[PDB]
């Protein structure tokens, strides 16, 4: 009886305003809304007010911070910490499951070397953001990406181990089915390793990163869904993807597909 | 109905000769023997002769190569490749499931940096190793170790992804329960990620790396065993560990404990 809690990033639903998109999401029973972190503090009232009376809640906050935490430049690491804290505080007000963060993209250089001593440093920095997140009633969430976008953190099991070592309820992780296609031999095993640390999930079609279903037989999430069920996953599965067809047609088709696959898992 | 195929490294069983140790192994129904690869070519006759008429086969070959494949010194990398090929040919003559290899230990320096370019080079080298091993009816087996011994390759999911990318019937991976204690949030998840590439398993007590059971309640392999059953694992589970107590008492106890947990999984 575990529920699939679907969520959408802000650009997913058709509509000319935030309220039109939310109406569309309510029609489909999509219960999570995932905004970007950019300017979030200034959007708290807008978002709260649009959600009032709806069966929709803020799920994760997708990034939005400046700089990156593995820069060799302490000023850039501080920029990342400071901008993350601004977002975290707004995320807390919005009841968010947490703020998504990539430690370093490929092109974010110069970066600290990929060594154990750097990993310890990352864990310390994340412990500091997590303590702040927890005070604000939220978390920070490591996102692994595939090799085309990052090398540092690519697999859910790696992110989960970081979280276990940090041992902070404000420090969690996630898996993105797009990235997992390229970096996980098993979506199920990855999510199982995620376990109690798995705070969010991203979903997209698995060849073109468009709406689930637009890549036909490649868009198979059953193995991952079996992992989510085995861990009792109770957070959101949120769309982060493009769109090839007519959004009024393909968005509902994606929701239908994920629900069918959830039932089969 | 999946069977647990127990194996011992050479120093596990009590005895003053290889034949005495094998006699002890047969009495406990341990069917796998795991010798080190050091001077293996020169022991092929010895091992064949000792195994004649016995219900014991060679399982994996534990390392034995010189140098390391991630050295910045081409001569050291070549030493690794050349000595691995010697061992691989002997492994094949002995019907081994594969030769275990760690890309780089912490003290093996200077080493290539942990970057995507190094990962590509590692894949090229293992592909060469694997083509040779397949020709000889065996494999090479990546072993992830914990942070106290290595940084480069620590998790089963990472090793499995290397195997998937290399895509060679001669290149496989393993999990060692000792190392997994420190590097895996889920033994089940780790082995599920291992999947079709999982070729061997090491077992030890989980606090002091001694005989299973010597660390009491910490010596729980159920979760991992569930993962092995879920993937239809049909290779060996091999003891690589020390011994705190009377070897004549604690070795049979460890075998008994593992068989009990396997039945519970
Ligand atoms: Mg994502
Ligand atoms: Mg081992």
From TrEMBL, chains A, B:
Transmembrane stretches, start-end: none
Record's keyword annotation contains S-adenosyl-L-methionine: no
Keywords, sorted A to Z: Isomerase, Metal-binding, Signal
Molecular function in Gene Ontology: isomerase activity; metal ion binding
Ranges where the Xylose isomerase-like TIM barrel domain occurs: 25-260
Record: residues binding Mg(2+): 143, 176, 202, 240
Top-level taxon in the UniProt lineage: Bacteria
Coiled coil: none
Protein name: Xylose isomerase-like TIM barrel domain-containing protein
Record lineage: Bacteria, Pseudomonadati, Bacteroidota, Bacteroidia, Bacteroidales
